[PDB]
């Protein structure tokens, strides 16, 4: 059955064959012999199951273990909305276990917060963590920014040059024609204000925008591409040296995002009656107060952290952004948190708690969204997709219940801690 | 068949020759809703861990604005033994995320097909050409510098003057023995190295650092912690455990102290990318590449008033292989520090020598995630699966080093797109 | 050695006073109690006599009673002293001052005044003010001018502090707070609101330039009229500190590295391949090997915020000490990334920058209202303020910091860079 | 005014005018003037001279005072260039009761109403039982930086120091330089082919920056032996660190570390600093933790440690341009007693870079201060010991600074003028 490979070629070359005709072990077969290269494997055959197939077996020759790919699933999966979109060279997926903590009361509504997590106890503990708010009446949040940024450096050829430039851009006209630039590249392109930062004739600019329920990186560089050009018209000694200068910041810690802010900040606050405190997290209000200065605040201080004034917000954010088809690298900055708690009520035994998260990177659209499992979770929050009637709506709810489960987390790990229940 | 009344339901479900196998789903929720079986005692009620996740899943569709929401969501035919009671509660299914191999990497003198589990367009293909431009370079070299997870409580003594007295009894060669004494008999792979402390006032943080063997190690590192401050408390009876961890580890928050002293394994990566390779795998100049990692991973970090964020996109691609190979992806906050340093080399001063230098990876091969079969597959792709019996602790050391490499792969491709402004996927 | 009864009938005259008494009579009135430590301010005529006398009281309750020897006290002006610049006053502490120039800086010269007591300091930074001046000469700009003071306050609740925060960024609601701050003074000019919330706490930076003035003083009355006002339209917010740290004054903080604070600029030069080699005793591609690993490098591996620089600090507090400026706010006017490249037809030219986003910095006001702090303000020509363009003084004095400052950095990093520490 | 001719022959004979002249005539080079002149503040009076015709305003010199005072201390030593020296007041804050002891604290400044704050802050330490305080730690750093060909070799460098047979080579070195030179373990971090080596030791009671940059590179000499492919790029790589804000000080310490503590009664806090217990923690918690934590601080959690770190710093010889890292203080504030209305404060500084001899502590004047607090000079019995207790001091002083200004922001009390 096996044929040569002058005889298979011209099969494929065929318009009305294609690969179809040709067996598993015949494509194998051009590869190793190398008339077509290992990259020509996408756009000759016909469904994308059957080239992760040949990509896999190709692998399992190449790998010290034959048998390693075999607990890997990869087939009855829709590849059609991940091929050329959210993955290349693809052998597979990976499974992640997902629960659900809740109800979480926020905002005098009920959200069932699904999370893909490998940890043990953490939908459990944020589980507790919902039932000490929703006995308590509820939590509330409030998003007070919304933005996303991109941080590119361009090089004058002096100083004195990039101090022009930063003055030109800080009037009112000059500024004006850099945002119509930036406007007219997408419908959410709506230039906020600017930051600029001058170091020596390096100059970074912080552009910032609102990007509807998209997370909005790929709108965003390409406002920040035009704005760049429209910039270049009248400044041509300068040289654009990135489109990313890291002053975004994009995926790596940055106290410029913490201060300022990047993508949806947002705050939540929650009141826990004392009688709570007891029954559900199993220790006092004096207890948690306690334990949030001297770890969250103190300790935190101690190991000379920026933005990491929290037990464990990255757990939660995490967890929430797997599963909701998040760019879960972007845990890095979006896991910034304060956890604060205080004395309240009348006999100053009640647990006042809030968590202010400034730089939450989020989207309902785009991304990992694009895919259906990960659509069934944003539809279980009801955020799912844009929001026709109201622009970036849907982004911010999901923001305010994942400020709303990090505050549970915070309550129930800190709960443990305090009172010693570490099993 | 058509749901059988409430009280016989309750007599099948109770007989113990039966139970809830000859029920119907339809019969268990309508037994639900009544309040007869409580609801929450389902979970051992139920015969397979399937069927308890296909009941769960029904009964909070009817508590959703949307009850078809969970449709796409799959949850049939995956193993649920090995992550019951272990790696998730309340579980209604799993969220596949697509598996890419970027590869062969070279890496001290062998090759890797690296797995990357994503959502993220180009990351994948990106990565893939990094490897290309090392591959043709010679390969990369690797170190592992530094290895010992860590746990960071806080007690509190009295007074400033008590919580220093503590201070030195543990800085003295007598107190150390004993507490390393103690926090190694909680373990084998149990070896405590030299204690970091500081204080607060009457607030005393402790870090414990120690190897973990192939394990992450934080479960094994708080064991040892726990019992080597009772140890301390049979000393110092004044002093309080306020908590078995103060923030000082610092396990999943940005901090300056993994940065400076390491946590987890701390590695260093290296390659000699030649001039032609520079321009015809990552089309650039080695001269323009040096141009944006100094004005963008050093100063344009600077600027931002970053603490390890040195790198262009290290997150990326630590947080593809970690949930493609079981680790716990929060930890990519610690992680994914990292600086990405670029020089001129060789004779005529084209070639492009890089480094990736990551004081804090926090990785294992054994425990956690790594213990379900399809992330095992992804271990057993690079060879690092499980616990090496003859050297414990090279499985976790070698995937420390895999990281690092794709790293810097993900670094040399990147880099190279913003110098030549090829932004376009 | 009269007795106390004959020597409170001298001091009662008002013809005679404690002119007629010795220091041992004083002092003999004070131990034993009939003339208070309190009212010795008003009895003695002269400052110089109240200084000796509260010496001599406190030599008595040292372990070494002579230990004031050599600290100096007499023929000092302690007249624009007592009252506003330090109390309890005991004497005065000589600085060392050095001259450092001529600093060719944006087509004019300066002669810099630097007090320290750090050998070779201004020698090192002489050594760097004659590279720049033999390469044509530094360039510097101004490119924000605001000093900050950042109050905390406190609403019941999250969702109230969200509400105060939204309505500061109308301009309808900002329009009313800046009018308010603007009324305090006649250089009161409220900038943009930067503001930050932390559940109900809302941390509020205001803005504003001070004409030639750091303007700490000025800041703080326009905040506190502000702050009044706003609390008209929000009554049940609390002010729980006219500076909850947010500013921030005298501690390290990202926030002044990245929004500026004072002054912020930059300075630059391009120093001839001839002149590294002559006068700096080395090579330009020895001095950016040495800013990449040790300036930018290695104060990343130190986890440093600011710190991007080799001893910017010793210039600034040099300049600080002899020019009547807050020594303390060398914590944050210090901050400064040093750039080196390659420059030139053959790249072996050396350009350096450096830029300093916090320089906080007054030509009027504090210990610039001192003769010898002025004095050393005026060889700079800068005393003062300048009528016809308030601000420029301080602004130009901002300039002479960030130059010298690049001066320091030519000369020590050259140092490194050969091996040339003796 | 003789000509130039007769000039030419011994430089006593000379005038003014005629020494001026032959600086603008280039007889003398200006480099061949320093010896030439015996009498130093004769030699401070020409440079004055000279410069004064550079200046704008010549007459600027004025009241920059320069006569009778003391340059033999100064010159070859302290500063050069010199046209004269700028007074700064000196005033006292105490007693400052710290340890059982009491001190007269001196505080040079122009910042007004700083030496009344840090005295009513004194005057409530004392009447609360007094201030108890530590030294922790005790070693200044200097941190050079190192490169070889590779990231491995600079690993096997790494590598080789960790062990103790490394690590005791280096020792002799280092302690091979000086009496006083102990080295302690060596912090070491990689950035590629870079190595950043943290050298730490005791300096008995100098500060002790020249003796360890001795002793480190009589080190770094040592290591080249073995590895003789190692460049020293710079002695110092900015890991020490010196003079710029690092958390590496924050976090492992340099020069000493300590702390400080007190607890005021209720009564204290309601008569001298006119504000509340619950009043004081608010304020503590709000600004000088979760503000500093806003603002991005690392090691700023105070309220103002650098004014009374700054004071002190100038008014006993220190090197003040250390106030960058020296200042560092966490200022921690609780309720305490058996009623919860009494305040219990602490302040811990672990990066006071410190000195009671070398430097400016050789000049007399500053000595002065020193001695009033019985700290001058060089401890003789126990090395060091007078350059721990000036650091307990200070952290002392700042407690009491903390105390009062922190009293002044919460009950709003921020009229200077009374
Ligand atoms: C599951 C997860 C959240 N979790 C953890 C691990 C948190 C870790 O991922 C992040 C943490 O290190 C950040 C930090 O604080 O520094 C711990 C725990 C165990 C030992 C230890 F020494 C410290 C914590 C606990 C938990 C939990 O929440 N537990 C629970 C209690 C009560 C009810 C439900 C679950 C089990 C015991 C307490
Ligand atoms: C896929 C991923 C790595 N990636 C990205 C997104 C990186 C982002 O996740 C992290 C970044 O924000 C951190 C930072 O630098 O601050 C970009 C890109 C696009 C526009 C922009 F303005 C900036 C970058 C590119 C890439 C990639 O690598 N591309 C490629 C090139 C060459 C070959 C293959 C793929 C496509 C174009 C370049
Ligand atoms: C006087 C001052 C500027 N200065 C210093 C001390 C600077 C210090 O205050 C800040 C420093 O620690 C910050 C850092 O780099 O981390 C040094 C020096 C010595 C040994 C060492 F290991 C490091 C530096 C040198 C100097 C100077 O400049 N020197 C000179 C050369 C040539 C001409 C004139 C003076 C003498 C030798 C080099
Ligand atoms: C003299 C100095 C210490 N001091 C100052 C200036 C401190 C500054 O150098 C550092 C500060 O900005 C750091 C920060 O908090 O962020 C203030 C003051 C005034 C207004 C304001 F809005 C804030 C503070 C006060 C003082 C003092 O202590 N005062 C006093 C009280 C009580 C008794 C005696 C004097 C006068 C009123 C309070």
Redesign the pocket.
Known sequence: EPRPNEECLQILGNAEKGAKFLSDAEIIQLVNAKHIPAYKLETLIETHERGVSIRRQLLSKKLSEPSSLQYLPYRDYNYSLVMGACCENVIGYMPIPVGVAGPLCLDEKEFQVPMATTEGCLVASTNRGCRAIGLGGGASSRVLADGMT??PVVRLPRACDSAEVKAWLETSEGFAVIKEAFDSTSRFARLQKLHTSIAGRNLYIRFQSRSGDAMG??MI?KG??KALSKLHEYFPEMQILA??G?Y?????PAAINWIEGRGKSVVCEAVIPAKVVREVLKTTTEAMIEVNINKNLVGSAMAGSIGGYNAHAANIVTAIYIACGQ?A?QNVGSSNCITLMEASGPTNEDLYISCTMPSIEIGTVGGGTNLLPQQACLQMLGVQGACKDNPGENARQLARIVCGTVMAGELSLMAALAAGHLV
């Open positions: 991109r941080g990186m790929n560089s920040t591409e489109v990313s890291n975004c910041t994009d995926k790596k760019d690298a």
